[PDB]
């Protein structure tokens, strides 16, 4: 080690942990939680952000004085990546869009950028590289989102062989776009667009468990070079899941929106993914192997959906 990066303190805010992480995509749903947990234990977080500085203000309270540092970067400019990972020990990558835009398509957010971040990380001496993928990633899947996730996951495993590739399922939480999707898009102005909802089986994982899993992959030395699958305790039927969501939100459920500029809310590919069936890949290690217990949907679903609820609830039925 180096005398600076030796852990000190009691793991709190003003303590030292020796983790010096660059988190790309720190301003997203998954990024805000990772930065939060890295900053509870006194890590040095470099936050490369493309957005306005205003959009990052929520991250500033998450660290002590000096612990969170912000940088500009452009996925196309490699030298902006290098300035971001030059002094780092772990480089976490959470870059993605649920939708394409004019400038970045799914093959640029998921293949060309992650490969560039991984290559510069190798050439800059970085030791640990966390790359996020999807559980349902498949070269033969119709959803273009997942096919890009498959190729990009293939290039990371060649550029940075010692990289930890994490494959979660649909992640649910307060700011998720999974249960918030079933509560809003299905309800307001519409009746569910479920396409044969009885044929889809879903295994969703809580955000904090994914956040915990990512951290322990940094602190666990056997995680290097290993691909993981983070899945919830239970498998649900997509039809029942939507039904259960509605009961929590006290919105009546009756079985049976164009993409646009701004931020497509509901899209062609999103439906193709909400219907893809959560692959079971037993040989891949999961949260069990990182010291995290997957948390039930039922506990952490009233938390997510209490806002939609306007102004005595029965759980869903699991699929063995």
């Amino acid at each position: 080690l180096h005398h600076a990066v030796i852990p000190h303190g009691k793991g709190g805010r003003s303590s030292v942990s020796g983790i010096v992480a660059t988190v790309f995509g720190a301003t997203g749903f998954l990024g805000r939680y990772v930065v939060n947990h890295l900053g509870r234990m006194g890590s040095q977080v470099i936050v490369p952000h493309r957005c306005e500085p205003y959009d990052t203000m929520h991250l500033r309270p998450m660290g002590d004085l000096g612990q969170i540092i912000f940088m500009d970067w452009n996925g196309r400019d490699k030298d902006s990546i290098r300035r971001a990972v030059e002094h780092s020990s772990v480089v976490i990558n959470l870059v993605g869009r649920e939708w394409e835009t004019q400038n970045f398509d799914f093959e640029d957010v998921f293949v060309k950028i992650p490969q560039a971040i991984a290559q510069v990380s190798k050439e800059a001496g970085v030791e640990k590289f966390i790359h996020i993928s999807h559980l349902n990633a498949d070269i033969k899947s119709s959803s273009k989102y997942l096919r890009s996730k498959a190729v990009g996951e293939k290039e990371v495993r060649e550029t940075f062989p010692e990289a930890t590739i994490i494959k979660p399922a649909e992640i649910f939480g307060r700011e998720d776009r999974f249960l918030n999707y079933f509560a809003n898009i299905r309800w307001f102005g519409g009746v569910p667009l479920i396409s044969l909802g009885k044929k889809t089986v879903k295994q969703p994982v809580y955000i904090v468990d994914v956040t915990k899993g990512i951290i322990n992959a940094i602190k666990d030395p056997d995680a290097r070079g290993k691909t993981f699958a983070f899945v919830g305790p239970s498998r649900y039927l997509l039809f029942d899941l939507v039904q259960y969501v509605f009961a929590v939100a006290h919105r009546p459920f009756l079985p049976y929106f164009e993409i646009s500029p701004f931020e497509p809310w509901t899209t062609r590919d999103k439906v193709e993914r909400i219907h893809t069936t959560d692959k079971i890949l037993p040989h891949l290690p999961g949260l069990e192997d990182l010291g995290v217990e997957a948390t039930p949907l039922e506990l952490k679903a009233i938390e997510v959906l209490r806002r939609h609820r306007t102004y005595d609830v029965q759980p869903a039925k699991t699929i063995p």
Partner: protein
């Protein structure tokens, strides 16, 4: 005429920025002494209203929160409550040593060591208390910070 999309976005961005900085309605937590200097910034000599900054703004029409005094542990939940109710865009101005980092009660058991532990802060105004003129300099620094925002220009390149 002829104009690019980049040019249109740059000019619209200047319009909304000019409006947002020209009409800053501040909410003020007058927690302690520093509230007295905030009141002097409203009095005749400096007259913050002449910049377009209204003397009194409700929490749910406010554009900027000015934290003027010591934030104790008993008070911290209420300040975060007010902050969440504020509609965006929202900015926090930390006024004086107490709010900046605890100041002269920094080593107290009942005091938050800086309001940046509770809410994100955009400008820090030093002093114990900062002079009314020193606070006015801080607000004018927030106007320049807003002038440099590029929300639309970023949105175009997304």
């Amino acid at each position: 005429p002829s104009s690019r999309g980049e040019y249109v976005v740059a000019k619209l961005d200047d319009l909304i920025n000019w409006a947002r900085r020209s009409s800053l309605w501040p909410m003020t937590f007058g927690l302690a002494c520093c509230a007295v200097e905030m009141m002097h910034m409203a009095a005749p000599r400096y007259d913050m209203d002449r910049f377009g900054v209204v003397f009194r703004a409700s929490p749910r029409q406010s554009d900027v929160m000015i934290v003027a005094g010591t934030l104790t542990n008993k008070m911290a939940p209420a300040l975060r409550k007010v902050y969440d109710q504020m509609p965006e865009p929202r900015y926090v101005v930390s006024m004086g040593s107490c709010a900046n980092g605890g100041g002269y009660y920094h080593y107290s058991y009942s005091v938050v060591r800086g309001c940046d532990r509770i809410v994100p802060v955009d400008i820090y105004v030093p002093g114990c208390p900062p002079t009314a003129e020193a606070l006015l300099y801080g607000i004018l620094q927030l106007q320049k910070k807003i002038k440099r925002e590029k929300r639309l220009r970023i949105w175009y390149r997304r």
